[PDB]
């Protein structure tokens, strides 16, 4: 008898939830008695932008309509070169602190992800730039 069962009828409905602004009318007893949703109808919008349920005849103003973007496009210089980063970080010899050497870095694409993976790095705190955002911002010089 473990296979095949005769059960009664049953019905159930399921819905999902969205983040919305609702106007709820608490009665004198404090239980919910009326409710409206702003983002359903223009009449609902003008109801909930005046904080009332009955609105008198007249013109009214509500949220400003704006055109949502359809897609995204990113344009960077078409050059594809590796910046001389590792050789700087893997240089056999470093100059003295009083004799610091300044190098020009340009005309290349710099990838900081490979630098992130180096274990013995100690000091990494970037003030004017968020450290995680160095992989998507173009550097003049």
């Amino acid at each position: 008898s473990s296979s095949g069962w005769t059960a009664g009828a049953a019905a159930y409905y399921v819905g999902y939830l969205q983040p919305r602004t609702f106007l709820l009318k608490y009665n004198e007893n404090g239980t919910i008695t009326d409710a409206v949703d702003c983002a359903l109808d223009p009449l609902s919008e003008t109801k909930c932008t005046l904080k009332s349920f009955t609105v008198e005849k007249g013109i009214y103003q509500t949220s400003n309509f704006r055109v949502q973007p359809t897609e995204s496009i990113v344009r960077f210089p078409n050059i594809t070169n590796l910046c001389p980063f590792d050789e700087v970080f893997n240089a056999t010899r470093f100059a003295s602190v009083y004799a610091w050497n300044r190098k020009r870095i340009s005309n290349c694409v710099a990838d900081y992800s490979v630098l992130y993976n180096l274990a013995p790095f100690f000091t990494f705190k970037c003030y004017g730039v968020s450290p995680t955002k160095l992989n998507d911002l173009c550097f003049t010089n």
Partner: protein
């Protein structure tokens, strides 16, 4: 447009402006009184016939 003159094209700024309270809706109401007034002065000076 309070929500866009301040944080135009920035969703997070608009969210940040939301917690500032009933400030933007105050100006939309305040300037509406000025806007509707200009439809009364001319409706009072010129509509005496």
């Amino acid at each position: 447009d309070c929500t866009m003159y301040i944080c135009g094209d920035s969703t997070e700024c608009s969210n940040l402006l939301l917690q500032y309270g009933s400030f933007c809706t105050q100006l939309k109401r305040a300037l509406t009184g000025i806007a509707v007034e200009q439809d009364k002065n001319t409706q009072e000076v010129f509509a005496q016939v």
